[PDB]
Amino acid sequence: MVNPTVFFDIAVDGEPLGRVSFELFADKVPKTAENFRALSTGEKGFGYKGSCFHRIIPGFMCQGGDFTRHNGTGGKSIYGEKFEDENFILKHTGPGILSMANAGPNTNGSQFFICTAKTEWLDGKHVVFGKVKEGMNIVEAMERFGSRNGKTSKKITIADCGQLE
Numbered sequence: 001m002v003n004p005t006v007f008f009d010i011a012v013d014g015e016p017l018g019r020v021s022f023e024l025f026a027d028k029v030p031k032t033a034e035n036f037r038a039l040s041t042g043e044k045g046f047g048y049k050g051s052c053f054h055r056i057i058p059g060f061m062c063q064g065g066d067f068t069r070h071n072g073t074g075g076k077s078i079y080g081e082k083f084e085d086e087n088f089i090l091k092h093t094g095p096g097i098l099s100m101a102n103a104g105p106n107t108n109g110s111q112f113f114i115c116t117a118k119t120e121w122l123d124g125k126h127v128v129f130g131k132v133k134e135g136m137n138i139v140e141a142m143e144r145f146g147s148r149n150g151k152t153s154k155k156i157t158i159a160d161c162g163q164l165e
């Protein structure tokens with residue numbers, strides 16, 4: 001079939017900003033893509049809606065997906081607490097790359113990051129599974145609320161999220 005597309009509706013201190021949409025690479029990382037897809041729809045009873053981008057470093061990346069500790073230490077996959085690195089077929093080529101955050105080999109949960117630069121040192125250690133399709137202007141707006149140490153000057157939230165036709 002066709003690779004799924006997922007959207008995030010982003011808010012800044014509760015104020016609507018815009019929509020970021022993502023192509024998920026189910027054709028190359030079906031397991032990893034399915035996790036992010038189901039967390040986006042909330043169809044297992046948990047996921048990304050209402051959570052925040054807790055760490056944003058301009059010229060590097062926007063990190064989110066921690067809906068259990070809201071700070072980078074939590075989250076869980078649709079398969080259990082953690083799942084294996086599925087493969088490293090896809091590389092971190094530039095801005096818009098969507099990739100899994102982790103704390104060691106085989107520790108993927110729900111946390112993910114959106115690259116805003118090429119981050120080749122992450123290749124072969126973070127599983128890349130998607131890419132921003134629309135709203136890279138919105139990801140760039142988000143990023144302006146980050147800082148050098150990653151603390152956001154405003155609260156950046158996924159006000160709504162879902163799967164698109």
Ligand SMILES: NC(=O)c1ccccn1
Binds near residue numbers: 101
């Ligand atoms: N430690 C992590 O999950 C990480 C996430 C994004 C970029 C670099 N490292």
Ligand SMILES: NC(=O)c1ccccn1
Binds near residue numbers: 075107110
């Ligand atoms: N990606 C995760 O589930 C994670 C990443 C860093 C620290 C703790 N958990």
Ligand SMILES: NC(=O)c1ccccn1
Binds near residue numbers: 120121
């Ligand atoms: N490890 C690398 O290839 C690299 C490239 C630029 C900045 C930091 N690290």
